[PDB]
Design a protein around this ligand. Structure first.
Ligand SMILES: [Ca+2]
Ligand SMILES: [Ca+2]
Length: 279
């Protein structure tokens, strides 16, 4: 399958080189995988989800995404037009309020929820969790992300938007999950992207077009936007049987575009998520 005039990020993850416009992907497109988007929620009604998205848990008064962040992330994972894994099943877990903020306890609860809830779902190709969120280092938040990973969920988490070492941010600093830095369309590290040794992989993070609340779309920047590319790429590659939840992060790093990024500090991986698709 080839999506012409795709969002630059989708084109980037299916190309060895920047500046392409077509997203090339196996037509399986993450069919049979599940991705939990642990965020502000998902406007499941958005036509771009094609009925493949549903809210499964909220920790606030409504399951409704009143922010747009979660819908944007979910769109990058598996919307028809803006998603890496265009046939994956999306599950919204609303751990962030409609201002996009969430208590650590709530975020931990959402990770514990996914670890259990996946046992109730039909995800024959495996389960991914996209955590486009974070704050200061928390051993309990890292431990929660480690548990979700250990339960057999491919956990992708944002490195963070601090232009600092991800070691001081959670769950970014949890070694066992897939910590995702952001790149721009010119193969630069995104100016805001966290770095450091704990980063596993970069994904497109700057000026990422995706779904938004009210059935709309918008372009926003963040390691929050890079994370769902990797989460979507994990769902995609697990559907193809190329990797498992336990090994997807390592597989994505092993199969990444190596050395394509600029402004990569010494000790940070120079690896950009890449689907290695050959028609
Ligand atoms: Ca290259
Ligand atoms: Ca890691």
């Amino acid at each position: 399958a080839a999506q012409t005039n795709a969002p630059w990020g989708l084109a980037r993850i299916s190309s060895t080189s920047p500046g392409t416009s077509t997203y090339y992907y196996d037509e399986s497109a993450g069919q049979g995988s599940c991705v939990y988007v642990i965020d502000t929620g998902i406007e499941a009604s958005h036509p771009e989800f094609e009925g493949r998205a549903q809210m499964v848990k909220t920790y606030y008064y409504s399951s409704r995404d009143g922010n747009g962040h979660g819908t944007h992330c979910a769109g990058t994972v598996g919307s028809r037009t803006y998603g890496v894994a265009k046939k994956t099943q999306l599950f919204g877990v609303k751990v962030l309020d409609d201002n996009g903020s969430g208590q650590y306890s709530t975020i931990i609860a959402g990770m514990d929820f996914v670890a259990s809830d996946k046992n109730n779902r039909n995800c024959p190709k495996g389960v991914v969790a996209s955590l486009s969120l974070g704050g200061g280092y928390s051993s309990s938040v890292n431990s929660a992300a480690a548990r979700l990973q250990s339960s057999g969920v491919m956990v992708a988490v944002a490195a963070g938007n601090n232009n600092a070492d991800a070691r001081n941010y959670s769950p970014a600093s949890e070694p066992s999950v897939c910590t995702v830095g952001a790149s721009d369309r010119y193969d630069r590290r995104s100016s805001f992207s966290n770095y450091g040794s704990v980063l596993d992989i970069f994904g497109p993070g700057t000026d990422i077009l995706s779904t938004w609340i009210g059935g709309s779309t918008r372009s926003i920047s963040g390691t929050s936007m890079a994370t769902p590319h990797v989460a979507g790429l994990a769902a995609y590659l697990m559907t193809l049987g190329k990797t498992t939840a336990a090994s997807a992060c390592r597989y994505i790093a092993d199969t990444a575009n190596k050395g394509d990024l600029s402004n990569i500090p010494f000790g940070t991986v120079n690896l950009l998520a890449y689907n290695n698709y050959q028609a």
